[PDB]
Design a binder for this molecule. Structure first.
Ligand SMILES: CC1(C)[C@@H](O[C@H]2O[C@H](C(=O)O)[C@@H](O)[C@H](O)[C@H]2O)CC[C@]2(C)[C@H]3C(=O)C=C4[C@@H]5C[C@@](C)(C(=O)O)CC[C@]5(C)CC[C@@]4(C)[C@]3(C)CC[C@@H]12
Ligand SMILES: CC1(C)[C@@H](O[C@H]2O[C@H](C(=O)O)[C@@H](O)[C@H](O)[C@H]2O)CC[C@]2(C)[C@H]3C(=O)C=C4[C@@H]5C[C@@](C)(C(=O)O)CC[C@]5(C)CC[C@@]4(C)[C@]3(C)CC[C@@H]12
Lengths: 583, 583
């Protein structure tokens, strides 16, 4: 259902705070959800659990963990319907109401919930256990594989993506209420015809006893259009368009109305009116060419891992404005909903991406014993959930289906083909892409024609023609010539950068130095400006972030333009110089 | 010839200073050495040239470079014989006297010289040009291979060892004089009978008209013994032995005496009376069991590359005493002669190693198109030169023939077999070893039985069972159990460590972190003390040093226990605690 909010007809209780916490063990205490959890450990809830406790065993845990607390259902919610929702459980979440299992959810970055109305009475207290598993298989969405170390028998988790596999309840948890007759979902699609905006709306409600009313109210509070019935099309004369650096949001009020025109339910949905179209080599927002600038990001901060953080979000956006970035990509999984809402308000453009990284074992990637049909089912599901949650965001401008898949290999085409079709059928208003890895050159890639925009990740400077920028430059523009020659589509570089340690400086060409980072980005830009077909540049990455451990990762990925704590490297100042002065 | 010194009969002029410097190029000036060099560039000589100039083209240069200066032979040197000597030219040096080639030397780390007596008159000035080439082939001592980048034509140098291929005149240059009848070489060998010390000596001198006297003088200037003739045996009653941690050096004056008892030539040779023996599993110095503590090192400092530096030498030795290290290994090439002399006086023990690192392409490494018989000729030459130079140092206790050869492969035994014998045949006073890489396990290695002591380099914690210390413990232990049950020899660990950035800290098990470094060294020690056959532990590395450019090297190699500028990481304090509280 829709993201809960408080209305005149709905109440909303945060369940954030400290919960009791335990790992699964191998004792008789199988089934921790059947009684009061016995632990001194408390884990804060919007957070990944891994780095919270300064304990290796928790950090390295493979398998299930348990969060628990008591909840009291407000006494005045008899006569109403009520749910427990996890905005996200990374990767597999189970909800229990006193020992009854009431939801079982497999994706790691989208919402799930359970209607507990008939299990617990208003004003009753219950024990809420939420079990979350972190295990990845070749069928989970980021896929991976658990192994056992021979000598010690320690379980270990392998996977093919960079960022660390933080787990837990990294986003907030809620108790909320709706009326018996309630709104469940709303879809809004926005076109523009001259100066007139139009909203195609569709409301889905638990009942059609009593009817649906809509009002559309502008930023000044004046009702600018009205409509009746669950589905319809509204015109808005002289619209204020939502624009890439000037957000404008109307506010769509969907209500359920009884025989007496008495409101029995209501929901307020923020709406930006704007259009995305791809025309040849151009990416058009409101019929005008747009050029992405900004980053691929990560949900990653010092202690709470991937947990949502209001402050770092608002700061992160301020830093985007400060350097004149107009966009980012939700690199390698959907971010928290609040980020998308905030982007809507900040006038920031978003490439919104599924959790589908790691579909590459370079052993044939797309085969029965690796990334097969059952993985595609999970991928299809990821696509549906992402789209079902983020479809109404004006800031969301395109769907990214995957990141660095092995789109050069046999089987890749048979695997991906249905997916861009599924997306476009779920949401026909946005174009679809994926992020292409170096191995799938314009010659070798077998999947690119099935997409509306091409996104490329490239590290010519760093990984291959190492510190040889003149060699990287030639190879970069060879590759881009190939792509422009072969496809009539917009090109966005979604990765390009260099690991860089704050304070490490050199007047020579030296990788891992701030000078090198600047020089490489600056070369890439020179090359970008040589190609009419370029529609965007998003540096990798906004900020240093944590990775699986490895002799080649210096306490994480240090390709950030800011440090993990958001201090700017020289690179940051270079981008600021370029993005505040370019078109 | 012997390392030149000033005596009553010999003069010695330093030619260190700034020299004019030029890269070779494709100009109508093939042949720089034939006229005054045209450059504004001056390179200081005891220095590698690569980082001096803050210029990428000089640094990345592949091939020849030219140093030049004017030199004046003293007017008072008529009636004498005189030479120009390079202590070292990395890797291939040529000496030119006004356009005449007079020396052509091929290894990068040993002396060469030319007698110019008849080409330049006393009191004459001449133009001294020394050409030095950096190119590594599969036949050079560190071997390597030059390649050409496809798009640009940049000439580039590949090789298989870590440390950066610094080139140039990294050690001092000299003009010196010797009488017509002179001492060319001395060999001293030292045994003990009870409390009497016995010096076996042999003097090689240019002629025999008039004879050889020898005097042995103690640290007090008291002549303690004498002898006549170009070779013989000197008896020293109640000898002051040379000991690890308590140097004592006698001073052996070889003279040439004419028909009158008038001195014609004299040379003063520092000697320490000491024996080295391997009996089963023990390493014995003066019939007392010995345990190595310290480091593999590198000649490497911030701007002068491999340039010898007195301050860093004295300081580095001071840091060794501070942490109670008693030894180091001349990791990957012979060090400056002056370091060996200083080790003699400091009572520091030395594993002295040839430049033969990188004999490993893991394609078969020991074949005609890789390490082949001509390569083995170069290797044999390197062994001869090293032994010829460092034969008289009591500090030097064992020759290391190579570092990380692929001694697990077919052909490796046929390649190395002659090499231990050659060393033992040139110098029968010391054991011979080599440093064994992880591929070459106790099972797989096929070379180890030809050596007197086994040295192992092992990185279980860092490179293989990464951050998994218990897993590394088990595999380290297994391995060592394999070597001890298979050979009756001393086992010295010569590499073990982890990249560690100063300042990077963590309460968790975190590679590259100061805490991790300590946790790993500490564990390795725990395993060492379980095995009676261990004869030494030498950490890799003493200090952070520069390497070739690469995404897995953070502006060089950071496995130092000290920083490049010699600041202690947490690990330095751990070793200090360990080595000062045990023998
Ligand atoms: C690592 C990935 C998957 C890709 O994404 C990465 O982004 C960031 C990073 O690189 O640091 C991090 O977020 C994280 O590490 C990853 O998600 C970056 C590109 C990537 C490293 C590819 C390459 O860079 C280049 C490769 C070349 C291609 C080719 C044709 C060549 O250049 O000659 C063959 C050789 C080689 C090394 C094959 C591997 C890839 C495709 C590589 C390393 C794969 C992984 C990519
Ligand atoms: C790099 C060397 C030659 C060795 O010496 C180096 O020490 C330091 C360093 O590693 O950075 C520096 O001083 C410098 O770079 C070198 O002198 C260190 C060990 C070394 C890296 C080996 C390993 O660490 C482990 C390897 C494993 C072992 C293997 C084959 C097995 O026996 O089962 C499994 C796979 C692998 C990766 C094969 C390579 C080696 C033997 C490796 C990397 C070889 C190079 C070694």
């Amino acid at each position: 259902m829709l993201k809960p909010q408080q209305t005149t007809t709905r109440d909303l209780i945060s369940l954030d705070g400290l919960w009791k916490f335990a790992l699964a063990s191998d004792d008789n205490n199988t089934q921790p959800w059947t009684s009061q959890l016995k632990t001194s450990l408390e884990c804060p809830v919007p957070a990944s659990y891994n780095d919270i406790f300064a304990d290796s065993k928790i950090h390295d845990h493979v398998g299930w963990v348990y969060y628990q607390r008591d909840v009291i259902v407000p006494k005045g919610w008899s006569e109403e319907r009520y749910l427990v929702r996890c905005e996200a459980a990374t990767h597999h979440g189970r909800i229990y109401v006193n020992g009854n299992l009431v939801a079982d959810h497999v994706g790691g970055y989208t919402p799930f919930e359970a209607d507990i109305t008939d299990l617990v009475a208003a004003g009753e207290q219950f024990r809420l256990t939420i079990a979350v598993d972190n295990e990845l298989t070749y069928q989970t969405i980021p896929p991976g594989k658990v192994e056992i170390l021979e000598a010690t028998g320690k379980k270990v988790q392998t996977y093919q993506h960079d960022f660390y596999n933080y787990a837990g309840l990294a986003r907030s948890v809620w108790l909320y209420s709706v009326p018996q007759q309630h709104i469940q979902d709303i879809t809004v699609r926005t076109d523009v015809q001259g100066t007139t905006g139009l909203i195609d709306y569709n409301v889905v409600a638990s009942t059609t006893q009593g009817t649906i009313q809509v009002a559309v109210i502008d930023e000044d509070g004046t009702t600018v259009a009205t409509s009746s019935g669950s589905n319809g099309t509204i015109h808005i004369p002289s619209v204020h368009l939502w624009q890439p650096g000037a957000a404008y949001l109307y506010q769509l009020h969907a209500s359920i109305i009884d025989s007496s025109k008495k409101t029995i339910d209501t929901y307020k949905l923020a709406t930006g009116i704007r259009t995305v179209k791809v025309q040849g080599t151009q990416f058009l927002i409101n019929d005008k060419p747009f050029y992405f600038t900004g980053f691929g990001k990560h949900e990653d901060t010092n202690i709470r891992g991937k947990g949502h953080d209001d402050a770092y979000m608002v700061h992160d956006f301020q830093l985007l404005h400060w350097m004149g970035a107009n966009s980012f990509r939700t690199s390698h999984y959907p971010y928290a909903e609040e980020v998308m809402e905030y982007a809507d308000r900040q006038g920031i453009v978003v490439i919104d991406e599924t959790p589908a990284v790691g579909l590459a074992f370079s052993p044939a990637t797309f085969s029965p014993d690796r990334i097969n049909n059952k993985t595609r089912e999970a991928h299809a599901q990821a696509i549906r959930e992402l789209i079902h949650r983020d479809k109404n965001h004006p800031s969301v401008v395109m769907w990214s289906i995957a990141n660095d898949p092995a789109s050069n290999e046999d089987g890749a085409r048979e695997y991906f083909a249905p997916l861009p079709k599924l997306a476009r059928q779920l949401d026909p208003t946005r174009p679809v892409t994926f992020a292409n890895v170096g191995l799938a050159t314009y010659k070798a890639d077998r999947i690119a024609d099935l997409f509306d925009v091409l996104c490329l990740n490239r590290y010519f400077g760093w990984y291959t023609q190492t510190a040889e920028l003149d060699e990287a430059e030639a190879a970069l523009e060879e590759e881009l010539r190939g792509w422009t020659e072969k496809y009539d589509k917009p090109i966005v570089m979604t990765d390009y950068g260099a690991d860089t340690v704050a304070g490490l400086h050199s007047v020579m060409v030296t990788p891992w130095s701030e000078e090198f980072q600047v020089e490489m980005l600056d070369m890439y830009h020179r090359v970008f400006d040589r190609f009419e077909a370029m529609a965007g540049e998003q540096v990798w990455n906004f900020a240093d972030f944590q990775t699986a451990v490895g002799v080649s990762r210096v306490d994480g990925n240090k390709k950030g333009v800011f440090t993990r704590d958001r201090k700017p490297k020289a690179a940051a100042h270079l981008l600021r110089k370029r993005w505040t002065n370019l078109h």
